[PDB]
């Protein structure tokens, strides 16, 4: 892969894959429509986050990662973030479903899809089983602002809610 | 792929994380461990039926809750195991069980790692899914066995059929 850095732009044609949070797919053994979501159009003129993970419903990200970007989402939205996606390896289907054990509606946050881990491998930062590594990247109006890996898999500290927030901080 | 008489394949082995109460919660994720189903199986009466994946549309509204709501006619006719199948990992298998309210092992919820074992059989489809299908095994022989017609057909591997191919 490429890697990231703060001061690159955000990859053209990067596409993922996810169904769209509806009320009357809301119950977790309802199944929506899974669509295409080209985030480099998309995320053009918005201010994003987005956090990768090994996978939906493993226990680190499960437990910590995504309640805890849940937690702060009141705290990122009032310093200008417009979107918030977590994104793993993982079909349209199950992120979806994700979504719904967290609780989340609407697009409060983005249960996204990176199919085949294709966006993740194209920067080097995905593992040897396919899975998207854990990372996060700050992408201000197609700019990336932060980006940070972790030095290992069940490690979150780098792409945290709270340390994302405090680059946000400043 | 296999029929009625067929010898299951020997060394196949799936993935999943067994239940357990203090994972009870959707949001509380267990540590996926191997589970040899050639070993497990050779003296045990199975059902095994894998379909395209957890939390899809046909799968969830109607082919796991027939297996679930037809459990106790299903233990009633000597069945030990009843197990899904399908290419999502362990983690999400798991997850999915406790979205459909099974517990403990009334029915197990199993990964097929890169459908390796479905591809084995030529069972799988172009994208990596297992296909939707069924095996009854009985002492490590095949009793029947039922190939869908397409991904979202549900017939020949439902609770109902294969409930009455169960003599
Ligand atoms: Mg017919």
Known sequence: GSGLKAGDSFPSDVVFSYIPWSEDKGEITASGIPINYNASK????????????????????SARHVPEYIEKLP????????????????????????????????????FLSDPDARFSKSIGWADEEGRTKRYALVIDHGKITYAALEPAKNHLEFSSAETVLKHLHH
């Open 42 to 61: 998309e995320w053009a003129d918005k201010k994003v986050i987005l956090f990768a993970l090994p996978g939906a419903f493993t226990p680190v990200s």
């Open 75 to 110: 705290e990122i939205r009032a310093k200008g973030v417009d979107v918030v996606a977590v994104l793993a390896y993982n079909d349209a289907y199950v992120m979806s479903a994700w979504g719904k054990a967290n609780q989340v509606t609407g697009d409060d946050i983005l």
